[PDB]
Structure 1
Amino acid sequence: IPGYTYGETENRAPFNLEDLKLLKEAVMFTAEDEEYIQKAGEVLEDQVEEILDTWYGFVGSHPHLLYYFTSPDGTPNEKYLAAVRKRFSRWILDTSNRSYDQAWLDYQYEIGLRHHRTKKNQTDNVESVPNIGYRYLVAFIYPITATMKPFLARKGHTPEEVEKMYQAWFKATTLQVALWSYPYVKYGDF
């Protein structure tokens, strides 16, 4: 997979392993979540393909959003919309499968920079908008969540065991997007 530099970042995560403990705590993540995430994962793996479509159906309906993929002239750099689509789809099962250990943190950091102007579009060789406005990152917590509820219950799951899956996806996202802000935030305020 092209540009998937997981574990081969080799520039350290300027946030430590203790940090994720305190943040996990803020986002109320308990080991009792760890089970249902992995479950959630195995719920989604097979179905993954349809998920990217639903989600791409969304970004695609909004211009102020799709713009963030468009070449300098304002039309979607698709060699760039098939290379992200790939890495992101690696990510969903990475959220249901990697243990949240240091290298997972090395790369949470990397994905911030990839949204940031520090390292947006370098990976994928394309010419496109300079930076992604952080406001939308935060925003993407809701759709990336809501749109997931339906999928979690299609492979047949009781209405309260599913709730624990969604509830786990919810927390897992907020936590991530939380760490991504580093290159966005003025030093000392993160």
Structure 2
Amino acid sequence: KIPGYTYGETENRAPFNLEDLKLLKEAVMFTAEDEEYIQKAGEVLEDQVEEILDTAYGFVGSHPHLLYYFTSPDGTPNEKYLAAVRKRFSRWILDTSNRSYDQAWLDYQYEIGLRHHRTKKNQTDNVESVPNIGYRYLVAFIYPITATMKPFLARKGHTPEEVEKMYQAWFKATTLQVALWSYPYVKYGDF
């Protein structure tokens, strides 16, 4: 088990429902085919997670304004914070690949959005850090997250066609999630 990780155990229901999710899946072109391919993506990625994490956090670490969101008040990275989040992000890779996108999934989507947002940021790990991750960067990061996965999706010898299907599934699923995470950021009634 993973400190702070509360998938299936959250103490509120998402403000969006499974019909919302159906309609949003449609908007991101995500079908049963992507369910199959995202699970394949997971089989490919799961034993490469350490390099994936180094690559993702390598990017974050290289830009002071991104590393910012993990910083203590003194502007230095909070290493406790980075380490705890890293474990939860590792598990997110698997959840994205392996979970049914069902109500528990939706409820945790709400929770992850809340944790990036000022509502709950810094509470899971009991750290003193910056209060809010600007929404602009959540959207932005759809790109790096997907770009990070791409080279790894090839490393088990899958063909460019099969890799493209996995990569596209990942792209759709990452976009889907960030769309959901906007909820706590967006003015009531505008979501």
TM-score, scaled to structure 1: 0.99
Q: CA offsets per residue over residues 116-162 of structure 1, 9 Å max, x none?
A: 00000001010010110000000001111112111000111111111
Q: 4+ residue stretches of structure 1 with deviation over 3 A?
A: none
Distance 2:133 2:71 in 1: 12
Greater share of helix residues, 1 or 2? Answer: 2
Distance 2:148 2:186 in 1: 29
Distance 1:181 1:87 in 2: 19
Q: CA offsets per residue over residues 81-131 of structure 1, 9 Å max, x none?
A: 000001010000100000000010001000011000000000101001011
CA positional deviation for 1:10: 2.4
Quick one: percent identity of the two aligned structures? 99
State the SS of the aligned residue for 1:149: helix
The equivalent of 1:95 in structure 2 is 96
* Structure 1 unaligned residues grouped into runs of 5+: none
Distance 2:23 2:103 in 1: 15
Distance 2:117 2:48 in 1: 30
Distance 1:86 1:29 in 2: 27
**Match status 1:44 vs 2:45:** yes
Distance 2:124 2:149 in 1: 28
Distance 1:130 1:64 in 2: 14
Distance 1:91 1:16 in 2: 20
The equivalent of 2:21 in structure 1 is 20
The correspondence of residues 75-90 of structure 1 with structure 2, limited to 5 A, is 75-90=76-91
CA positional deviation for 1:170: 0.5
* Structure 2 unaligned residues grouped into runs of 5+: none
Distance 2:162 2:8 in 1: 33
Distance 1:189 1:177 in 2: 16
The equivalent of 2:166 in structure 1 is 165
Distance 1:89 1:147 in 2: 13
Q: CA offsets per residue over residues 19-44 of structure 1, 9 Å max, x none?
A: 00000000000101111100010001
CA positional deviation for 1:48: 1.0
For this pair of structures, how many residues does the alignment match? 190
Distance 2:105 2:174 in 1: 14
CA RMSD of aligned residues (A): 0.6
Distance 1:146 1:128 in 2: 27
CA positional deviation for 1:59: 0.4
The correspondence of residues 64-83 of structure 1 with structure 2, limited to 5 A, is 64-83=65-84
